[PDB]
Structure 1
């Protein structure tokens, strides 16, 4: 058969990933422009939301050195790929868990609906890639929203998860943090309530 050049193989991002990708977290000075956890300036159209979460290992212990990258549509269901800190909204962001509490946060807007390649609408979602010490190749997941029950039920991606019980692992819980709309999305890498991870 036809063999292409092989892809460069992945390796763990390691416990000191913050040196390269989360400078403040490492304890170091930042550069003039950093790619970080605020996807929306206050003037961005859409519903402004806080996202937060904790990451657990197979023993139910916090993964305190996790690093997350996120990719999401703007409120109108459009992916904005021209990354610029001058923009009111960027579709891409980065965050990391705090070493003491194990909590990450993101500041964004709720994404609009995007169609799959067959033209079927997907429920509102944020694409997440998870990196850490002990993770050899990053884990892909999606964060969906518990207040989108009717869309979630019809999502062609959620519907590829064979067991309905597993679909629940991808649904973030609406709450209020300091009077602001928030959603909690915890990830369990392994064992009871293991988060669905994707290959594509």
Structure 2
């Protein structure tokens, strides 16, 4: 059959990933421009939200060296690929877990609705790629919202998860933090309540 060039194989990001990708968190000086955890300036359109979560291994223990990259639509359900720290909104960002609490945060707006390739609406979601020492190839997941229950029930991506109980693992829990809408999204890499991870 047809064989193409083989893809360069993945390797773990490693414990020192913060050196190249999370300069502050490593303990090192930052350059003038950094890809980080603020996708929205205060002036961006949409509902402003705080996201937070922790990451657990198969023993129930915090992953304190993990690195997350996210990709989401703006409030209109459009992806903004022209990355610029002058933008009020960027669709892409990066965050990491603190070596102390093991908690990551992101400052963004709630994404609007995007259709799948067949034109069926997907519930509002943030695409997540998880990297860390011990993780040989990054894990893809989605963060959906518990105040979108009715949209989530019709999502054609959520519905590809065969067991309804596993879908729960993708639903962030809404709260309030210092007067701002916030959601917690914890990730369990392995075991009881293991978070659904995607291949695409």
TM-score tier, shorter chain, comes to over 0.9
Deviations 1:34-87 (A, max 9, x none): 000000000000000000000000000000000000000000000000000000
**Structure 1 stretches of 4+ moved >3 Å:** none
**TM-score (normalised: structure 1):** 1.00
Deviations 1:2-42 (A, max 9, x none): 10000000000000000000000000000000000000000
Structure 1 CA distance, aligned partners of 2:90 and 2:96? 18
Deviations 1:95-119 (A, max 9, x none): 0000000000000000000000000
Structure 1 CA distance, aligned partners of 2:3 and 2:125? 35
Structure 1 CA distance, aligned partners of 2:51 and 2:164? 24
Structure 1 CA distance, aligned partners of 2:140 and 2:111? 18
Q: Report the 3-state secondary structure (helix = DSSP H, G, I; strand = E; otherwise coil) of the residue aligned with 1:159.
A: helix
Deviation at 1:185, TM superposition (A): 0.1
5+ residue gaps in structure 1?
Answer: none
Structure 2 CA distance, aligned partners of 1:41 and 1:188? 30
Deviation at 1:179, TM superposition (A): 1.1
**TM-score (normalised: structure 2):** 1.00
RMSD of aligned alpha carbons: 0.2
5+ residue gaps in structure 2?
Answer: none
Deviation at 1:194, TM superposition (A): 0.1
Deviations 1:147-191 (A, max 9, x none): 000000000000000000000000000001111100000000000
